[PDB]
Amino acid sequence: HHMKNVLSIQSHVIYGHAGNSAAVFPMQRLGVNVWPLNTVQLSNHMQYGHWAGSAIDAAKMEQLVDGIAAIGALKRCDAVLSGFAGSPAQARATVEIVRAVKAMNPNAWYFCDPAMGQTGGIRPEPGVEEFIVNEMPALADGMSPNHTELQKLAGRRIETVAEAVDACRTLIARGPKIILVKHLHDRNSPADRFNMLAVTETEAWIGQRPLYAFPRHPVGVGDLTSAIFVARRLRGDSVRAAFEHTLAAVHAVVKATYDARRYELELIAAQDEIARPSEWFGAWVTDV
C-alpha cells in the first residue's frame, strides 16, 4: 500500500500535452506520485511551427536535485523517467541524476524514453542523439524507443517484428532489461494496425491497437505511452500486464482525440479509461 515516487525529467508544455504535460497526470491518475523536473517550459509544442520557451541549464538541474536530496527525499525515489533533452549538457545531467538516485536507492530503476522528436536516418545526429545512443543504455533499466529511435540505437534498418526483436536483444545486452518499442513499423502488418512490442531477455510480446488517421498526428502519444508503462510497472504489473494496460489506455486516449476531431490529446476527458480501460487488446508471443 506504499505509494511509489517517480522523478520525471522532461519538457513542460503550458498549452497541450507533451513531455511532462503528457506524462505527469497519467502517472498520478494511476496512483503514483510524480516529482516533475521541467527541463524547459514551452508555450506549445514545436510542431505548431512557432513557440516561446524558457529553459534551465544542466547546472540548475543538478542544483534542483541537490535540494530534493537535502530534505531527505531523493533517496525515496523509486524510478527516474527521462524524455526530451534540450541540449547535450541536459542529457549528461540526467545521467548524473540517475547515477545519484540509483546509488541512494539500490532498488530504483531508470526508464529512458529517447524522445528524439522529429528526426530520421539510422545515424545518430551529433549531440543529443549521439549521447542517447552511446551513453544512456549503460544506465537504463528500460528504454522506450519508437521505430526511428530503435534503428538509431541499434545502428540498423528494421522492417519486421523479428528484426525488431533481434535489435532489442542486442540493446538489452548493453544494459537495459526491457525495451518497449512504443511504435513499430511492421511491413507485414495491415495498414490499419498500430503495433507495439515489449522485449526482455526471455520474453517478447506483440500488441496491436487500431491505427487512427489524423490530419496531423497528435504530439505526446509516445510520452503518454512511456509514462503509463512506467506507472503500471511501479504498481506491480508484470511486463505483459503493464504492456497490455499501456496499449489499452493509449488506445482510449487516442480514440477520444480522434472522435473529438482534436489535435491535442483528450487526456483529461479520457482519464477514467487511463485508470481502467474498457476495451482490451491481448498481446501475443513472438521471438527472434
Picked from its own copies, Cl ion, none, the partner binding residue 50 (CB below 5 to 8 A depending on kind) is its own copies
- 34 pairs with which residues across the strands? 6
Picked from its own copies, Cl ion, none, the partner binding residue 185 (CB below 5 to 8 A depending on kind) is none
CA distance from start to end of the chain? 38
Picked from its own copies, Cl ion, none, the partner binding residue 63 (CB below 5 to 8 A depending on kind) is its own copies
Would you say 46 is a known binding-site residue?
yes
How many Å apart are CA 1 and CA 20, to the nearest integer? 25
- Distance of closest approach, residue 70 Cβ to its own copies, in angstroms: 6
- Distance of closest approach, residue 193 Cβ to Cl ion, in angstroms: 11
Can residue 38 be called a binding residue for Cl ion (CB under 5 A)? Answer: yes
Task: Return residues touching its own copies (CB under 8 A).
Answer: 3, 7, 12, 14-16, 21, 24-25, 28-29, 31-33, 35-38, 41-44, 48, 50-54, 56, 60, 63-68, 70-71, 73, 266, 268-269, 271
Residue 220 C-beta-side C-alpha neighbours within 13 Å: 27
DSSP letter, residue 110: E
- Distance of closest approach, residue 22 Cβ to its own copies, in angstroms: 12
**Which residues are CB-contacts of 196 (< 8 A; sequence separation ≥ 6)?**
180, 181, 182, 183, 184, 206, 207, 208, 209, 225, 243, 246, 247
How many Å apart are CA 56 and CA 178, to the nearest integer? 30
Would you say 47 is a known binding-site residue?
yes
Q: Which of residues 217-256 bind Cl ion (CB under 5 A)?
A: 221, 254
152 vs 209 by CB, closer to Cl ion: 209
70 vs 285 by CB, closer to its own copies: 70
Would you say 11 is a known binding-site residue?
yes
Picked from Cl ion, its own copies, none, the partner binding residue 122 (CB below 5 to 8 A depending on kind) is none
Picked from its own copies, Cl ion, none, the partner binding residue 25 (CB below 5 to 8 A depending on kind) is its own copies
Sign for the pseudo-dihedral over CA of 60, 65, 67, 70: negative
- Distance of closest approach, residue 136 Cβ to its own copies, in angstroms: 22
Q: Cα torsion at 25, 29, 33, 34 (round to 10°)?
A: -10
Q: Which of 28, 33, 41, 160 is in the footprint of Cl ion by CB under 5 A?
A: 41
**Which residues are CB-contacts of 206 (< 8 A; sequence separation ≥ 6)?**
161, 195, 196, 197, 283, 284, 285, 286
For 70, the grid coordinates are: 537535502
Picked from its own copies, Cl ion, none, the partner binding residue 251 (CB below 5 to 8 A depending on kind) is none
Residue 47 C-beta-side C-alpha neighbours within 13 Å: 15
Known binding-site residues for substrate equal 11, 46-47, 223
Known binding-site residues for ATP equal 113, 149, 182
- Give the interface with Cl ion as residue ranges (CB under 5 A): 12, 38, 41, 221, 254
